Amino acid sequence: AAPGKPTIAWGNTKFAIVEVDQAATAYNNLVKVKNAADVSVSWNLWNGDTGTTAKILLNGKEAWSGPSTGSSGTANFKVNKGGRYQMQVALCNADGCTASDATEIVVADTDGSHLAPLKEPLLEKNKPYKQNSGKVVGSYFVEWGVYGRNFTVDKIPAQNLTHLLYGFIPICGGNGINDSLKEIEGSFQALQRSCQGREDFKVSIHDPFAALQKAQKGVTAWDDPYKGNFGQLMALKQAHPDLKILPSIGGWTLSDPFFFMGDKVKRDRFVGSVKEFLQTWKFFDGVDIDWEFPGGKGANPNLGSPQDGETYVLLMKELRAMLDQLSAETGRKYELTSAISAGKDKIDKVAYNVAQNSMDHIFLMSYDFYGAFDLKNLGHQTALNAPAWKPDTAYTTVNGVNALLTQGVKPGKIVVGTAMYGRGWTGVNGYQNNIPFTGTATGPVKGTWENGIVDYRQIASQFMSGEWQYTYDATAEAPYVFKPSTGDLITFDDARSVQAKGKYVLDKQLGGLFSWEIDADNGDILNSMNASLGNSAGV
Numbered sequence: 001a002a003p004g005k006p007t008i009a010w011g012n013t014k015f016a017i018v019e020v021d022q023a024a025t026a027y028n029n030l031v032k033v034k035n036a037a038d039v040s041v042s043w044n045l046w047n048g049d050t051g052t053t054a055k056i057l058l059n060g061k062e063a064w065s066g067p068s069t070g071s072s073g074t075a076n077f078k079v080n081k082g083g084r085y086q087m088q089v090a091l092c093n094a095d096g097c098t099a100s101d102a103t104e105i106v107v108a109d110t111d112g113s114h115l116a117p118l119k120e121p122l123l124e125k126n127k128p129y130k131q132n133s134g135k136v137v138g139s140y141f142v143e144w145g146v147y148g149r150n151f152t153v154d155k156i157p158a159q160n161l162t163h164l165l166y167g168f169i170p171i172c173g174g175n176g177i178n179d180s181l182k183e184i185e186g187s188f189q190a191l192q193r194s195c196q197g198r199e200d201f202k203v204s205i206h207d208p209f210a211a212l213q214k215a216q217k218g219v220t221a222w223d224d225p226y227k228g229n230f231g232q233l234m235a236l237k238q239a240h241p242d243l244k245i246l247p248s249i250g251g252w253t254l255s256d257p258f259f260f261m262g263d264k265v266k267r268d269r270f271v272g273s274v275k276e277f278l279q280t281w282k283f284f285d286g287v288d289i290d291w292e293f294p295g296g297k298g299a300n301p302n303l304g305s306p307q308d309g310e311t312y313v314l315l316m317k318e319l320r321a322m323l324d325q326l327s328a329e330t331g332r333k334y335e336l337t338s339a340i341s342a343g344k345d346k347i348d349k350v351a352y353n354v355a356q357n358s359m360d361h362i363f364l365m366s367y368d369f370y371g372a373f374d375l376k377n378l379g380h381q382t383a384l385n386a387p388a389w390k391p392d393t394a395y396t397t398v399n400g401v402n403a404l405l406t407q408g409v410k411p412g413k414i415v416v417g418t419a420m421y422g423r424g425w426t427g428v429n430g431y432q433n434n435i436p437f438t439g440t441a442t443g444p445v446k447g448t449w450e451n452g453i454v455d456y457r458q459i460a461s462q463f464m465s466g467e468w469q470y471t472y473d474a475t476a477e478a479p480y481v482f483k484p485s486t487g488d489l490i491t492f493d494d495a496r497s498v499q500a501k502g503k504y505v506l507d508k509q510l511g512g513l514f515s516w517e518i519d520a521d522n523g524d525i526l527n528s529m530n531a532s533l534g535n536s537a538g539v
C-alpha cells in the first residue's frame with residue numbers, strides 16, 4: 001500500500017523575506033532583510049502507513065524532503081521568492097506518494113508579490129483616463145496625510161498617473177544636520193528615534209508607523225508583514241505595474257543634510273544607503289531628490305554654499321551610476337528625478353544642462369510664487385505668465401522654464417508643476433482698478449490645515465458661492481477668488497489654468513505635468529492635467 005493521506009497541521013501560514021519587527025522604533029531594528037523566508041509546516045497522519053519519505057511541495061515542486069519517522073512531522077525550509085503557494089505535504093514509499101490537500105501559504109516580499117492588487121474605484125470627481133499621451137502625469141502623496149487629512153493610498157486615483165512620488169524619505173542626522181525639523185513639534189525627535197544606531201547621512205523612514213504599520217485597506221490582518229503606506233504601495237504596484245512609484249528624499253524640512261554632501265565620504269554613504277533602500281523596498285522605481293535648495297534660501301537661514309551646484313551635479317551623476325548598476329542586477333528600469341525651484345535666481349545656481357544627462361525628469365516647482373509669507377507683494381502663486389498689471393513679474397512658470405531652456409536643458413526633461421491648493425491673505429486693502437493684487441495685506445487667509453494655505457477641494461466646496469468674487473486672469477492664466485468685505489484673497493490653479501499649462505507643455509514639447517499634493521484635489525485638477533496633455537478618456 002502507498003502511504004496514508006497526511007493532514008496539514010494548523011499553524012502560521014504567512015512568512016516574510018523582509019521581516020518587520022513589530023516591537024522596534026529604530027529603523028535598523030525595524031527591518032530585517034533575509035536572503036529567503038524561513039518557512040514551517042507540520043502534519044499528522046491519522047490513517048495508514050506513514051511512508052518512508054516526507055516532502056513539502058509548493059505548486060507540486062518539492063521545497064523540502066526528509067525521512068518520515070512518525071505519525072507527526074515538521075519541516076523547516078527556505079523559500080526565496082515571494083508569492084502565494086499551494087503547499088502540500090506528501091508521504092512517499094516504494095509503492096507511491098500520497099499528497100495532502102493543498103493549504104495556501106504566503107511568502108511576503110517588498111514588491112508586493114504576495115498581495116492582492118489594490119484596484120479601487122475612483123472617488124469624488126475623478127474620471128478615468130488612459131496613460132497614452134506619452135507625457136508625465138505625476139502627483140505627490142504625503143506620508144503624514146493618513147492622519148488629520150485622512151487621505152490614504154487606497155484613495156489615490158492611481159490609473160490617472162504615470163508617476164507617484166512619496167513625500168518624504170528623511171536622511172539621518174541630529175544637531176546641525178536636521179535643524180529645520182526642530183520647527184515642527186516632535187518631528188526632530190521622531191527622526192532621532194528612527195535613526196538610533198544608524199550613521200548620519202543614511203536614509204531612513206520618518207514615521208515607521210504610518211509607513212509600515214497603520215492598518216489600511218487590504219493590509220488589516222495582524223499577521224500581514226507590511227501595512228501602512230508601504231504595504232498599500234506594494235498592492236498598488238500589483239494593480240498598476242507601469243505606475244512609477246518614487247521615494248522623494250528631502251522636501252522643505254528634510255533638505256538640511258544635502259548641504260553637507262560636498263564631503264564625498266558623506267555623499268558616498270548617502271548614495272550607498274539609497275541603493276540599500278531600493279534593494280530593501282522593491283516596490284520603488286528609483287529616486288526623487290528634492291534638495292530645497294542648492295545655494296540655500298530654504299528652511300534653514302544658515303545653510304547654502306557656492307559649492308552646492310557642483311555637489312548637486314556630482315550627486316546626480318553618482319546616483320545614476322548606482323541606479324545603472326542596480327538596473328543591470330535586476331533587469332528593471334530605474335528613474336532619477338528631482339524637484340527644483342522654479343525661480344531663475346535659484347535655477348542659476350546649478351548647471352541643469354549638465355545634470356540632465358543623469359536625470360530622467362526635472363520636476364519644476366512652478367508654485368509658491370507668492371503667499372502669506374509676504375504681506376506686501378501680492379501676486380499669482382502658480383501662474384503661467386505675468387499678469388497685465390505687472391508684465392515684468394519675476395516668478396512665473398514661463399520664466400522658470402525659460403531659465404532651464406536657456407541653460408541648454410532639453411525641453412522633454414521638464415515637467416511643469418500645478419498646485420492642488422491655494423495660498424492667500426486676509427485684509428487686502430489699498431488696491432486700484434479692481435485688482436486686489438496691487439494692494440497690501442494684514443495676515444494669512446484662514447487655512448484648511450495651516451494658515452495661508454487652502455486645499456483646492458475647499459476652495460471649490462466653500463469659496464465659490466456667497467460674497468466670493470471669482471476671476472479668471474487670461475493673460476497670467478490664473479484664477480483667484482476675493483471676498484471684499486474681509487479683503488480675503490486666494491490664488492490657486494483650476495481646471496482652466498491647468499489646461500493652459502498642459503497646452504503649454506504640448507506646444508513647447510515639455511515632459512508633462514505633476515502636482516502637489518494629491519490629497520487636496522477633488523478630481524478637478526488631475527482630470528484637467530490628464531485631458532490637457534491629451535490622454536484618452538475611459539478605462
Ligand SMILES: CC(=S)N[C@H]1[C@H](O[C@H]2[C@H](O)[C@H]3N=C(C)S[C@H]3O[C@@H]2CO)O[C@H](CO)[C@@H](O)[C@@H]1O
Nearest residue numbers: 140168250251252253254290339365368453516
Ligand atoms: C503648504 C504646505 S502643504 N506646506 C507643506 C510643505 O510642502 C512643500 C514641499 O515641501 C515643497 N516640496 C515639494 C516636492 S512640493 C513643495 O511645496 C510644498 C507646499 O509649498 O512641505 C512640508 C514638509 O517638507 C510640510 O511641513 C508643509 O506642511
